[PDB]
RNA sequence: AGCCCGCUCGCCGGAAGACCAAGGGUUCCUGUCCAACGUUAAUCGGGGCAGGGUGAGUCGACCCCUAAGGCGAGGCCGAAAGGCGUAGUCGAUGGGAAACAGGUUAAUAUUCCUGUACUUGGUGUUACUGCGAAGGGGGGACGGAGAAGGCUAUGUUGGCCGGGCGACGGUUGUCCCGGUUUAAGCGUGUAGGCUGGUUUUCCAGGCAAAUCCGGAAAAUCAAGGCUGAGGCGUGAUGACGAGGCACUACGGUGCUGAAGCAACAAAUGCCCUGCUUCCAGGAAAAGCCUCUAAGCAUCAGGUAACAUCAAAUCGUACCCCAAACCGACACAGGUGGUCAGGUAGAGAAUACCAAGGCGCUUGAGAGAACUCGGGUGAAGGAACUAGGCAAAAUGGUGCCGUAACUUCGGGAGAAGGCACGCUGAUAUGUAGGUGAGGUCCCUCGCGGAUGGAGCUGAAAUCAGUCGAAGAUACCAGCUGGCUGCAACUGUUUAUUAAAAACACAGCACUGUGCAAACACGAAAGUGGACGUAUACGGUGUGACGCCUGCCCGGUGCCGGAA
RNA sequence: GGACCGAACCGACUAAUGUUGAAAAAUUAGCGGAUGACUUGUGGCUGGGGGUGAAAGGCCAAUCAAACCGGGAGAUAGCU
């Protein structure tokens, strides 16, 4: 449910929260947790290589099963959980043999639902099958790009892919970007859309709320001195150059894709 | 007012101590220069 | 067993002072200067062998030497180990 | 004058007191000296010289364990130097056994002594006996906010004990002064918190195995277990103890020793790593518990009791809101953590005090101008000035009352008004809080219910009363109107600029299909991200409201290709 | 609750003083924030055309439109 906060203070006036009462209020499932310490966007040279990253809340990593390779064995959804590491919610599932795993929570999935993976699985949300065994036209998520590698496409809240065509060893997918993409038919996918579609209706409302998520402020190039950025300089507000990145590449329309290796798999670019 | 020198023996030894100097070829060159000059004290090491 | 060769090197001198004197006639404790690297176990063994007395316990401390000038010529005196040796009651030295 | 002793005075007291870590290193204590040092003198000193002083199984380090991070056998990469990184190995600011009270030195003390404890390990017995890991599972193990209830530290008063009976009017009493302290440990398992328990059978899970954990299904029983402040008992026929007595080497030693209770108030401490709630979703590894594998088989090993031995080494003085550390100085500066009494007070503000510590290492006079820091001011009241700069003023609590405008929250403490001390009565102390004895019950205990002595105790009204003045001191909003800019809280030119600048939530364009774009890097790699287009990067704009017009010639970008 | 008033704590808006200072940036009286985009201890990482920067060319040991130290080095100086 989307909830607007009352304006009892200026920082609260524009806040819009996504309140989901179904999410587990307790602590996560300890065996599937790992530590995940922060980078500040610094690499192993200790240099900032991605700007605007730093601080925010400490977060434990939940081991999520993207492979969904435990075939033939039914699992029941124990509960839905908040996962700080991604936009989707996750579901703790219990296999009949006693194994517990986390999965991306599909739209509609609730505690008590039955899921299964493998070729003989039913066509129901949360079920994972090779796309060979999924009807053309189906909506899927958590789509593999290479057989056995684990889902890479359509994992973010509310996202999904459409299987538009099957032609031989390959299926054609329409991605959320609009891109038409070929993928091996042996690649697994999970039926349904990723849950938590209301994620995009959130309004942070204040500067501080971006800081909690480990985002540091962006300084405009035009606010800097020439020595710092191509846009820097001027007495008053001046510009008078084509917009570029801090490193001088045009940043309004110039295409940067350059991968001849994977060009063959792209049926049609997003635009 | 807070001045620039805020002593920590641990930090001193880790930054400038004998073993820090021996760790790299440039550090070893420092020691060679200091021996050649005939310093009574090669490093901050106590 | 600690070699007698070793035991003969560890005790260096009796330590004379008001505190040492009071320790002797109040707590039956003798104060020794001992080798810097002497352990409590060695000190005990040495006193029992060389002074022929029963030792209850040894306490030890390292005294840091002072800096002393000698006609505008500075030098640091050696650190030395002091031992408070508590003798069993009835023993005398 | 400055040292010592004494009497008085003043100052700090959430510190100008007491203590830790750090940093320093003998500055500590005693004797001695006063050349130099000390902003003066110095008999004094953190100065000179000599001697002394630091005592640990339990405090800390070392040690076991890991975080960020470092190094890194092989390895991958690189003209060389080297870079990165696997197995590993280091790395605390975090996890991991155990001691308290009293006494004592000129100078150490949870270290010495006295009393009373506790922990871990090695041996040897004795009894019983499936032990065994580099592997599995559990645990360790974790956020913010909020509110309570139960407590204690602690305080106050009474009682009790000892002492006093007053330089000046009164003071044998409803009077005055002082004391009324006692630990860890051990036993008890409470307020309260959490959790169903037990026994079978079966099983695609936990890299193999498992009796362990996980899963499934019955049966059976419902109170079993776990945790837990404090209290009470013991520890303690002890210790301590106001004083008194005997000696003084007038520093202080020796001997003895009363009472040692209760009520009430009460933390920011404890129960509480709890409970409730929220989203931003809150280390690791070992110790510890448990499971088996290979292996070992009346052995080793395990468990329990008893005995015995061991527990090394290094630190330990002294300074820390500083004359000993960082500031060239005995420098209005800076410096993390702990403790925190009384009266008034909401309070860790503030005033005055306590414990405790100090009077700031030049003094003596004088009482001009002028400068600094303050006090008061006739009449006027912003006329001052760039400008009300500075000053003056406002200032509390309760109740009444409060406009435009508004995003319906605000604006608002708008504005403005009234009351306010003390005494008495209601009521020899009220409403409330606390709660004893008794009584009865009981699954007889730290139990339940009633009971309500004693203790504590607002607020109000009425009547009186003193002053010029009762929020009397310290403390403690000036208010209102029009308007530019920026929505807002934030950020910034350490050291002349705090802003209208930066950021910001929000908006848009654009790139990016994952070995992503992009960035650091001759590279390997790494960040982006253990993310995946509801995502990520770049760029501009800058809440919100109403909106965002025309131009593609120029420059760029995108696309086409004959 | 980047809510309000207000100590600690963090800042630094005004004025006076000080300017061979008590101080190479402070003192005194007022002032802003004070549950947060807060503040602070310990340790760690980023290195010089490089870092880091809620962006002031700010900061990188009292030094910054290119740190410091040593070297090329007695640079060169139609200038004093
Ligand atoms: K999430
Ligand atoms: K910006
Ligand atoms: K510009
Ligand atoms: K820069
Ligand atoms: K500009
Ligand atoms: K400018
Ligand atoms: K005196
Ligand atoms: K004098
Ligand atoms: K050691
Ligand atoms: K204890
Ligand atoms: K000590
Ligand atoms: K001092
Ligand atoms: K005069
Ligand atoms: K006020
Ligand atoms: K204004
Ligand atoms: K505007
Ligand atoms: K400002
Ligand atoms: K700025
Ligand atoms: K044009
Ligand atoms: K054009
Ligand atoms: K630090
Ligand atoms: K440079
Ligand atoms: K420097
Ligand atoms: Mg960014
Ligand atoms: Mg932005
Ligand atoms: Mg600028
Ligand atoms: Mg440029
Ligand atoms: Mg202009
Ligand atoms: Mg122009
Ligand atoms: Mg360019
Ligand atoms: Mg001892
Ligand atoms: Mg010792
Ligand atoms: Mg020597
Ligand atoms: Mg004087
Ligand atoms: Mg007080
Ligand atoms: Mg030290
Ligand atoms: Mg000396
Ligand atoms: Mg002294
Ligand atoms: Mg003199
Ligand atoms: Mg001296
Ligand atoms: Mg210890
Ligand atoms: Mg390496
Ligand atoms: Mg190698
Ligand atoms: Mg280690
Ligand atoms: Mg530590
Ligand atoms: Mg002392
Ligand atoms: Mg908490
Ligand atoms: Mg009490
Ligand atoms: Mg508090
Ligand atoms: Mg001490
Ligand atoms: Mg002085
Ligand atoms: Mg000072
Ligand atoms: Mg501070
Ligand atoms: Mg005060
Ligand atoms: Mg006092
Ligand atoms: Mg005068
Ligand atoms: Mg006046
Ligand atoms: Mg006047
Ligand atoms: Mg007048
Ligand atoms: Mg007037
Ligand atoms: Mg005028
Ligand atoms: Mg005029
Ligand atoms: Mg003013
Ligand atoms: Mg004033
Ligand atoms: Mg009470
Ligand atoms: Mg105007
Ligand atoms: Mg603003
Ligand atoms: Mg502001
Ligand atoms: Mg400035
Ligand atoms: Mg300023
Ligand atoms: Mg702008
Ligand atoms: Mg606030
Ligand atoms: Mg600042
Ligand atoms: Mg001030
Ligand atoms: Mg405030
Ligand atoms: Mg400029
Ligand atoms: Mg500087
Ligand atoms: Mg240059
Ligand atoms: Mg040359
Ligand atoms: Mg020259």
Author numbering:
A (entry chain F): 2 to 272
B (entry chain 1): 1 to 46
C (entry chain K): 1 to 93
Q: What does the article say, verbatim?
A:
Here, we describe a family of relatively small proline-rich cathelicidins widespread among ruminant species. These peptides, named rumicidins, inhibit the formation of the first peptide bond presumably due to interference with the accommodation of aminoacyl-tRNA into the A site of the ribosome. Our cryo-EM data reveals that rumicidins bind to the bacterial ribosome in the NPET similar to other known PrAMPs but form unique interactions with the elements of the 50S ribosomal subunit. Ribosome-targeting proline-rich antimicrobial peptides (PrAMPs) from animals can be divided into two groups based on their origin: oncocin- and apidaecin-like peptides from insects, and cathelicidins from Cetartiodactyla mammals.
To determine the mode of binding of rumicidins to the E. coli 70S ribosome, we obtained a cryo-EM structure of rumicidin-2 bound to the functional mRNA-programmed ribosomal complex with fMet-tRNAfMet in the P site. Focused refinement of the 50S subunit yielded a 1.95 Å cryo-EM density map. A distinct density observed within the ribosomal exit tunnel could be unambiguously assigned to residues 12-27 of rumicidin-2 bound in an extended conformation. Rumicidin-2 enters the exit tunnel in a reversed orientation relative to a nascent polypeptide chain and utilizes multiple hydrogen bonding, stacking and van der Waals interactions to bottle it up. Although no density could be seen for this part of the peptide, presumably due to its mobility, according to structure similarity with other peptides we assume that rumicidin-2 reaches into the A-tRNA binding pocket. Surprisingly, we have found that rumicidin-2 has a clear density protruding into the depth of the exit tunnel interacting with its constriction point. The lower part of a spacer in a constriction site is formed by Trp23 and Phe24, which is a structural feature of all rumicidins. Backbone-carbonyl oxygen of Pro22 forms a hydrogen bond with the Arg61 of the ribosome protein uL4 while the aromatic ring of Trp23 forms stacking interaction with nucleotide A751 of helix H34 of 23S rRNA and, in addition, hydrogen bonds with the carbonyl oxygen of Lys90 of the ribosomal protein uL22. Phe24 stacks upon Thr65 of the ribosomal protein uL4 via C-H⋯π-interactions, narrowing down the constriction of the exit tunnel together with the Trp23. Due to high sequence resemblance with other oncocin-like peptides, the central part of rumicidin-2 (residues 12-22) almost perfectly aligns with the residues 7-17 in Bac72,5 and thus makes similar contacts with the rRNA.
